[PDB]
Short mmCIF file of all heavy atoms in Angstrom, two decimals:
data_model
loop_
_atom_site.label_atom_id
_atom_site.label_comp_id
_atom_site.label_asym_id
_atom_site.label_seq_id
_atom_site.Cartn_x
_atom_site.Cartn_y
_atom_site.Cartn_z
N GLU A 23 -13.61 -0.71 -25.25
CA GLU A 23 -14.41 -0.14 -24.17
C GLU A 23 -13.59 0.92 -23.43
O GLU A 23 -13.96 2.09 -23.40
CB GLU A 23 -14.91 -1.23 -23.22
CG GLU A 23 -15.94 -0.70 -22.21
CD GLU A 23 -16.46 -1.78 -21.27
OE1 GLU A 23 -16.38 -2.98 -21.63
OE2 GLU A 23 -16.98 -1.43 -20.19
N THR A 24 -12.48 0.50 -22.82
CA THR A 24 -11.64 1.46 -22.10
C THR A 24 -10.84 2.33 -23.06
O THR A 24 -10.33 3.38 -22.65
CB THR A 24 -10.69 0.72 -21.15
OG1 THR A 24 -11.40 -0.35 -20.51
CG2 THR A 24 -10.15 1.67 -20.09
N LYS A 25 -10.73 1.93 -24.33
CA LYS A 25 -10.02 2.70 -25.36
C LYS A 25 -8.57 2.97 -24.97
O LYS A 25 -8.09 4.11 -25.01
CB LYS A 25 -10.78 4.00 -25.66
CG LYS A 25 -12.11 3.75 -26.36
CD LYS A 25 -12.97 5.00 -26.50
CE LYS A 25 -13.52 5.48 -25.16
NZ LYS A 25 -14.57 4.55 -24.63
N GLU A 26 -7.86 1.91 -24.59
CA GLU A 26 -6.44 2.00 -24.26
C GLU A 26 -5.72 0.74 -24.73
O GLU A 26 -6.34 -0.28 -25.02
CB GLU A 26 -6.23 2.23 -22.76
CG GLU A 26 -6.49 1.02 -21.88
CD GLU A 26 -6.10 1.27 -20.45
OE1 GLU A 26 -6.45 2.34 -19.92
OE2 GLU A 26 -5.43 0.40 -19.85
N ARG A 27 -4.39 0.84 -24.79
CA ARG A 27 -3.56 -0.26 -25.26
C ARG A 27 -3.68 -1.46 -24.32
O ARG A 27 -3.48 -1.32 -23.11
CB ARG A 27 -2.09 0.18 -25.32
CG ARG A 27 -1.80 1.46 -26.10
CD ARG A 27 -1.88 1.30 -27.61
NE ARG A 27 -2.16 2.58 -28.25
CZ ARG A 27 -2.32 2.76 -29.56
NH1 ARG A 27 -2.05 1.80 -30.43
NH2 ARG A 27 -2.70 3.95 -30.01
N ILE A 28 -4.01 -2.63 -24.87
CA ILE A 28 -4.06 -3.83 -24.04
C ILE A 28 -2.66 -4.33 -23.69
O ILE A 28 -2.50 -5.11 -22.75
CB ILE A 28 -4.87 -4.96 -24.70
CG1 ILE A 28 -4.14 -5.53 -25.93
CG2 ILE A 28 -6.26 -4.47 -25.08
CD1 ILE A 28 -4.69 -6.88 -26.39
N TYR A 29 -1.65 -3.90 -24.44
CA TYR A 29 -0.27 -4.35 -24.26
C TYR A 29 0.58 -3.20 -23.75
O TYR A 29 0.69 -2.17 -24.41
CB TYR A 29 0.30 -4.89 -25.57
CG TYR A 29 1.78 -5.17 -25.50
CD1 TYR A 29 2.30 -6.04 -24.55
CD2 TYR A 29 2.67 -4.54 -26.35
CE1 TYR A 29 3.65 -6.29 -24.47
CE2 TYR A 29 4.03 -4.78 -26.28
CZ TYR A 29 4.51 -5.66 -25.34
OH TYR A 29 5.86 -5.90 -25.24
N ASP A 30 1.17 -3.39 -22.57
CA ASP A 30 2.06 -2.39 -21.99
C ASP A 30 3.47 -2.66 -22.50
O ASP A 30 4.15 -3.58 -22.04
CB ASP A 30 1.99 -2.44 -20.46
CG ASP A 30 2.99 -1.51 -19.79
OD1 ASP A 30 3.90 -0.98 -20.47
OD2 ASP A 30 2.85 -1.29 -18.57
N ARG A 31 3.91 -1.85 -23.47
CA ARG A 31 5.23 -1.99 -24.07
C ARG A 31 6.37 -1.69 -23.11
O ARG A 31 7.50 -2.14 -23.36
CB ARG A 31 5.32 -1.08 -25.30
CG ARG A 31 6.59 -1.21 -26.13
CD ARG A 31 7.56 -0.08 -25.80
NE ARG A 31 8.84 -0.19 -26.49
CZ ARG A 31 9.86 -0.95 -26.08
NH1 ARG A 31 9.75 -1.76 -25.04
NH2 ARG A 31 11.01 -0.90 -26.75
N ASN A 32 6.13 -0.96 -22.02
CA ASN A 32 7.20 -0.73 -21.06
C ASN A 32 7.33 -1.89 -20.09
O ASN A 32 8.44 -2.35 -19.80
CB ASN A 32 6.96 0.57 -20.29
CG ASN A 32 8.12 0.92 -19.37
OD1 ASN A 32 9.20 1.30 -19.83
ND2 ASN A 32 7.90 0.79 -18.07
N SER A 33 6.20 -2.38 -19.58
CA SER A 33 6.20 -3.54 -18.70
C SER A 33 6.41 -4.83 -19.47
O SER A 33 6.82 -5.84 -18.87
CB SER A 33 4.88 -3.61 -17.93
OG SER A 33 4.80 -4.80 -17.17
N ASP A 34 6.14 -4.84 -20.77
CA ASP A 34 6.16 -6.05 -21.57
C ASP A 34 5.24 -7.09 -20.94
O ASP A 34 5.62 -8.23 -20.68
CB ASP A 34 7.58 -6.60 -21.72
CG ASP A 34 7.78 -7.35 -23.02
OD1 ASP A 34 6.76 -7.62 -23.70
OD2 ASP A 34 8.93 -7.67 -23.37
N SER A 35 4.01 -6.66 -20.70
CA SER A 35 2.98 -7.50 -20.11
C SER A 35 1.72 -7.33 -20.94
O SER A 35 1.35 -6.21 -21.31
CB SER A 35 2.70 -7.12 -18.66
OG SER A 35 2.29 -5.76 -18.56
N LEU A 36 1.06 -8.45 -21.23
CA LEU A 36 -0.14 -8.46 -22.04
C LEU A 36 -1.32 -8.78 -21.15
O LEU A 36 -1.31 -9.79 -20.44
CB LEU A 36 -0.02 -9.48 -23.17
CG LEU A 36 -1.22 -9.60 -24.11
CD1 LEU A 36 -1.40 -8.32 -24.93
CD2 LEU A 36 -1.05 -10.81 -25.01
N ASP A 37 -2.33 -7.91 -21.17
CA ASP A 37 -3.52 -8.09 -20.34
C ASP A 37 -3.11 -8.33 -18.88
O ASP A 37 -3.74 -9.10 -18.16
CB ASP A 37 -4.40 -9.22 -20.86
CG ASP A 37 -5.80 -9.18 -20.28
OD1 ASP A 37 -6.14 -8.19 -19.60
OD2 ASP A 37 -6.58 -10.14 -20.52
N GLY A 38 -2.04 -7.66 -18.46
CA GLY A 38 -1.53 -7.78 -17.11
C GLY A 38 -0.68 -9.00 -16.84
O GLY A 38 -0.16 -9.13 -15.73
N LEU A 39 -0.53 -9.91 -17.81
CA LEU A 39 0.29 -11.09 -17.58
C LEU A 39 1.67 -10.93 -18.21
O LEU A 39 1.79 -10.37 -19.30
CB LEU A 39 -0.40 -12.34 -18.14
CG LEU A 39 -1.85 -12.52 -17.69
CD1 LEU A 39 -2.44 -13.81 -18.24
CD2 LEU A 39 -1.98 -12.48 -16.17
N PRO A 40 2.73 -11.40 -17.55
CA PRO A 40 4.07 -11.24 -18.11
C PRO A 40 4.28 -12.09 -19.35
O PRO A 40 3.86 -13.25 -19.42
CB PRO A 40 4.99 -11.69 -16.97
CG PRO A 40 4.16 -12.67 -16.21
CD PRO A 40 2.75 -12.16 -16.28
N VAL A 41 4.94 -11.49 -20.34
CA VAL A 41 5.29 -12.14 -21.60
C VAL A 41 6.79 -12.40 -21.59
O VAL A 41 7.59 -11.47 -21.44
CB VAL A 41 4.91 -11.28 -22.81
CG1 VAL A 41 5.13 -12.04 -24.10
CG2 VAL A 41 3.46 -10.82 -22.70
N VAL A 42 7.18 -13.66 -21.74
CA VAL A 42 8.58 -14.04 -21.89
C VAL A 42 8.84 -14.27 -23.37
O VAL A 42 7.99 -14.83 -24.09
CB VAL A 42 8.94 -15.29 -21.07
CG1 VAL A 42 8.58 -15.08 -19.60
CG2 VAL A 42 8.24 -16.52 -21.63
N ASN A 43 10.03 -13.89 -23.83
CA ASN A 43 10.40 -13.96 -25.23
C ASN A 43 11.31 -15.15 -25.49
O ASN A 43 12.26 -15.38 -24.74
CB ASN A 43 11.09 -12.66 -25.65
CG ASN A 43 10.16 -11.47 -25.61
OD1 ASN A 43 9.42 -11.22 -26.56
ND2 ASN A 43 10.18 -10.73 -24.51
N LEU A 44 11.02 -15.90 -26.55
CA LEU A 44 11.90 -16.98 -27.01
C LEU A 44 12.70 -16.54 -28.23
O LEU A 44 12.13 -16.19 -29.26
CB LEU A 44 11.12 -18.26 -27.32
CG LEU A 44 10.60 -19.05 -26.13
CD1 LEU A 44 9.73 -20.20 -26.61
CD2 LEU A 44 11.75 -19.58 -25.28
N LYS A 45 14.03 -16.58 -28.09
CA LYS A 45 14.92 -16.27 -29.21
C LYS A 45 14.94 -17.37 -30.27
O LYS A 45 15.29 -17.09 -31.42
CB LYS A 45 16.34 -16.04 -28.70
CG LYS A 45 16.52 -14.79 -27.86
CD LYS A 45 16.97 -13.61 -28.71
CE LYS A 45 18.46 -13.67 -29.03
NZ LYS A 45 18.89 -12.50 -29.85
N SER A 46 14.58 -18.61 -29.91
CA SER A 46 14.70 -19.72 -30.84
C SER A 46 13.98 -19.44 -32.16
O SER A 46 12.93 -18.80 -32.20
CB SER A 46 14.14 -21.00 -30.20
OG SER A 46 12.74 -20.92 -30.01
N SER A 47 14.59 -19.94 -33.24
CA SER A 47 14.08 -19.76 -34.60
C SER A 47 12.80 -20.54 -34.90
O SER A 47 12.14 -20.25 -35.91
CB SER A 47 15.16 -20.17 -35.61
OG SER A 47 15.48 -21.54 -35.47
N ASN A 48 12.43 -21.52 -34.08
CA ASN A 48 11.31 -22.38 -34.43
C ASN A 48 9.95 -21.72 -34.20
O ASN A 48 9.01 -21.96 -34.96
CB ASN A 48 11.41 -23.69 -33.64
CG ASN A 48 12.52 -24.58 -34.16
OD1 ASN A 48 12.53 -24.95 -35.33
ND2 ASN A 48 13.48 -24.89 -33.31
N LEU A 49 9.81 -20.89 -33.17
CA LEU A 49 8.55 -20.18 -32.93
C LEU A 49 8.39 -19.04 -33.93
O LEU A 49 9.10 -18.03 -33.86
CB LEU A 49 8.50 -19.68 -31.50
CG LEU A 49 7.13 -19.18 -30.99
CD1 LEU A 49 6.06 -20.27 -31.06
CD2 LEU A 49 7.27 -18.66 -29.57
N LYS A 50 7.44 -19.19 -34.86
CA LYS A 50 7.19 -18.20 -35.91
C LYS A 50 6.64 -16.89 -35.36
O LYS A 50 6.18 -16.78 -34.22
CB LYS A 50 6.24 -18.76 -36.96
CG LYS A 50 6.58 -20.15 -37.47
CD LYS A 50 8.04 -20.21 -37.92
CE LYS A 50 8.41 -21.58 -38.48
NZ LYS A 50 8.16 -22.69 -37.52
N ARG A 51 6.70 -15.87 -36.22
CA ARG A 51 6.23 -14.52 -35.92
C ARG A 51 4.83 -14.48 -35.32
O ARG A 51 4.61 -13.91 -34.25
CB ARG A 51 6.26 -13.70 -37.21
CG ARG A 51 5.78 -12.26 -37.09
CD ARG A 51 6.73 -11.41 -36.28
NE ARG A 51 8.07 -11.42 -36.87
CZ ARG A 51 8.41 -10.75 -37.96
NH1 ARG A 51 7.58 -9.90 -38.54
NH2 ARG A 51 9.63 -10.92 -38.47
N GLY A 52 3.86 -15.06 -36.01
CA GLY A 52 2.47 -14.99 -35.57
C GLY A 52 1.98 -15.96 -34.52
O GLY A 52 0.76 -16.08 -34.35
N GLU A 53 2.86 -16.64 -33.80
CA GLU A 53 2.45 -17.67 -32.85
C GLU A 53 2.67 -17.23 -31.41
O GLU A 53 3.70 -16.63 -31.08
CB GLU A 53 3.20 -18.97 -33.14
CG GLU A 53 2.85 -19.53 -34.50
CD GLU A 53 3.52 -20.86 -34.77
OE1 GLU A 53 3.87 -21.56 -33.80
OE2 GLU A 53 3.69 -21.21 -35.96
N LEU A 54 1.69 -17.54 -30.56
CA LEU A 54 1.71 -17.18 -29.15
C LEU A 54 1.23 -18.36 -28.31
O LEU A 54 0.30 -19.06 -28.70
CB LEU A 54 0.82 -15.95 -28.91
CG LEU A 54 0.69 -15.43 -27.48
CD1 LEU A 54 1.97 -14.77 -27.04
CD2 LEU A 54 -0.48 -14.45 -27.39
N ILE A 55 1.89 -18.60 -27.17
CA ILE A 55 1.58 -19.73 -26.30
C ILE A 55 1.26 -19.24 -24.89
O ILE A 55 1.89 -18.30 -24.40
CB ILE A 55 2.73 -20.75 -26.28
CG1 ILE A 55 2.86 -21.39 -27.67
CG2 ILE A 55 2.51 -21.78 -25.19
CD1 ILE A 55 4.11 -22.21 -27.86
N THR A 56 0.30 -19.90 -24.24
CA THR A 56 -0.02 -19.56 -22.86
C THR A 56 -0.48 -20.80 -22.11
O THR A 56 -0.92 -21.78 -22.70
CB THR A 56 -1.10 -18.47 -22.78
OG1 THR A 56 -1.25 -18.05 -21.42
CG2 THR A 56 -2.42 -19.00 -23.29
N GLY A 57 -0.34 -20.75 -20.78
CA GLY A 57 -0.75 -21.87 -19.95
C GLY A 57 -0.53 -21.56 -18.48
O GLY A 57 0.03 -20.52 -18.12
N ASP A 58 -0.98 -22.49 -17.64
CA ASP A 58 -0.70 -22.44 -16.20
C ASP A 58 0.61 -23.19 -15.98
O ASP A 58 0.63 -24.38 -15.68
CB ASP A 58 -1.85 -23.04 -15.40
CG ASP A 58 -1.60 -23.00 -13.91
OD1 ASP A 58 -0.63 -22.33 -13.48
OD2 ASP A 58 -2.37 -23.62 -13.16
N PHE A 59 1.71 -22.46 -16.12
CA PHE A 59 3.04 -23.05 -16.02
C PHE A 59 3.35 -23.72 -14.69
O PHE A 59 4.32 -24.49 -14.62
CB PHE A 59 4.07 -21.97 -16.37
CG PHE A 59 3.99 -21.56 -17.80
CD1 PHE A 59 3.15 -20.54 -18.21
CD2 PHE A 59 4.68 -22.27 -18.76
CE1 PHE A 59 3.06 -20.19 -19.54
CE2 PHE A 59 4.59 -21.94 -20.09
CZ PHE A 59 3.78 -20.90 -20.49
N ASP A 60 2.59 -23.48 -13.63
CA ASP A 60 2.82 -24.28 -12.43
C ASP A 60 2.60 -25.77 -12.69
O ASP A 60 3.16 -26.60 -11.97
CB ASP A 60 1.92 -23.81 -11.28
CG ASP A 60 2.22 -22.40 -10.85
OD1 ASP A 60 3.33 -21.92 -11.14
OD2 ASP A 60 1.35 -21.77 -10.22
N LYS A 61 1.81 -26.11 -13.70
CA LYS A 61 1.60 -27.50 -14.09
C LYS A 61 2.78 -28.10 -14.85
O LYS A 61 2.79 -29.31 -15.09
CB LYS A 61 0.32 -27.65 -14.91
CG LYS A 61 -0.92 -27.11 -14.22
CD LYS A 61 -1.12 -27.79 -12.87
CE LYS A 61 -2.38 -27.32 -12.16
NZ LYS A 61 -2.24 -25.94 -11.60
N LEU A 62 3.76 -27.29 -15.24
CA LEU A 62 4.96 -27.78 -15.91
C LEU A 62 6.07 -27.89 -14.87
O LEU A 62 6.54 -26.88 -14.34
CB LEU A 62 5.37 -26.86 -17.06
CG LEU A 62 6.62 -27.33 -17.81
CD1 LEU A 62 6.46 -27.17 -19.30
CD2 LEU A 62 7.83 -26.54 -17.34
N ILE A 63 6.49 -29.12 -14.60
CA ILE A 63 7.41 -29.44 -13.52
C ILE A 63 8.72 -29.93 -14.10
O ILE A 63 8.74 -30.71 -15.06
CB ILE A 63 6.80 -30.48 -12.56
CG1 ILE A 63 5.40 -30.04 -12.12
CG2 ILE A 63 7.72 -30.72 -11.38
CD1 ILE A 63 4.68 -31.04 -11.24
N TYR A 64 9.82 -29.47 -13.51
CA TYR A 64 11.15 -29.85 -13.94
C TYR A 64 12.02 -30.13 -12.73
O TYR A 64 11.77 -29.63 -11.63
CB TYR A 64 11.76 -28.76 -14.82
CG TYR A 64 12.32 -27.60 -14.04
CD1 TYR A 64 13.69 -27.43 -13.88
CD2 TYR A 64 11.47 -26.66 -13.49
CE1 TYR A 64 14.19 -26.36 -13.17
CE2 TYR A 64 11.96 -25.59 -12.78
CZ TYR A 64 13.32 -25.44 -12.62
OH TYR A 64 13.80 -24.36 -11.92
N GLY A 65 13.07 -30.92 -12.94
CA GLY A 65 14.03 -31.20 -11.90
C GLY A 65 15.43 -31.33 -12.48
O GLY A 65 15.61 -31.60 -13.66
N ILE A 66 16.41 -31.15 -11.61
CA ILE A 66 17.81 -31.15 -12.02
C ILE A 66 18.59 -32.08 -11.09
O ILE A 66 19.23 -31.62 -10.14
CB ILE A 66 18.37 -29.72 -12.02
CG1 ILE A 66 17.55 -28.86 -12.99
CG2 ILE A 66 19.85 -29.70 -12.41
CD1 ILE A 66 17.99 -27.41 -13.08
N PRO A 67 18.56 -33.39 -11.33
CA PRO A 67 19.39 -34.32 -10.54
C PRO A 67 20.89 -34.06 -10.62
O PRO A 67 21.64 -34.74 -9.92
CB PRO A 67 19.03 -35.69 -11.12
CG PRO A 67 17.63 -35.51 -11.58
CD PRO A 67 17.62 -34.13 -12.19
N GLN A 68 21.35 -33.13 -11.45
CA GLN A 68 22.76 -32.74 -11.41
C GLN A 68 22.93 -31.36 -12.01
O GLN A 68 22.58 -31.13 -13.17
CB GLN A 68 23.64 -33.73 -12.14
CG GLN A 68 25.01 -33.14 -12.44
CD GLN A 68 26.07 -34.16 -12.77
OE1 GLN A 68 25.77 -35.33 -13.00
NE2 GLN A 68 27.32 -33.72 -12.80
N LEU A 69 23.48 -30.45 -11.21
CA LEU A 69 23.98 -29.18 -11.70
C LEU A 69 25.08 -29.40 -12.73
O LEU A 69 25.73 -30.45 -12.76
CB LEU A 69 24.54 -28.37 -10.53
CG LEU A 69 23.64 -28.24 -9.30
CD1 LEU A 69 24.38 -27.46 -8.23
CD2 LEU A 69 22.31 -27.56 -9.63
N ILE A 70 25.31 -28.40 -13.57
CA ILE A 70 26.34 -28.50 -14.61
C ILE A 70 27.68 -28.87 -13.97
O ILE A 70 28.26 -28.07 -13.24
CB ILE A 70 26.46 -27.19 -15.41
CG1 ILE A 70 25.15 -26.87 -16.12
CG2 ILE A 70 27.62 -27.27 -16.40
CD1 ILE A 70 25.12 -25.48 -16.73
#
């Protein structure tokens, strides 16, 4: 419709949302994950 790139290669944001990159070998080329990460909670009872 708008006839423009949905992915901003300079911002590295897709459809306006930030994309974080995983270096790990387990996530294959064609796989993409998304969610409401505020629902993912973590804690650190001890710093390194």
Side-chain angles (χ1 to χ4, degrees):
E23 189 179 339
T24 319
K25 292 172 290 289
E26 73 173 46
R27 307 286 156 182
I28 69 164
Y29 171 56
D30 175 348
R31 185 260 175 277
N32 185 71
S33 175
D34 210 349
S35 59
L36 180 67
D37 197 8
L39 309 183
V41 187
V42 305
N43 293 276
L44 287 174
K45 292 266 281 181
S46 68
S47 63
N48 288 302
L49 193 59
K50 312 308 182 303
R51 179 69 58 75
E53 296 183 24
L54 178 72
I55 294 169
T56 188
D58 180 10
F59 293 89
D60 296 339
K61 305 303 182 287
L62 180 138
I63 309 176
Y64 80 105
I66 300 179
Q68 164 162 12
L69 310 178
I70 299 170

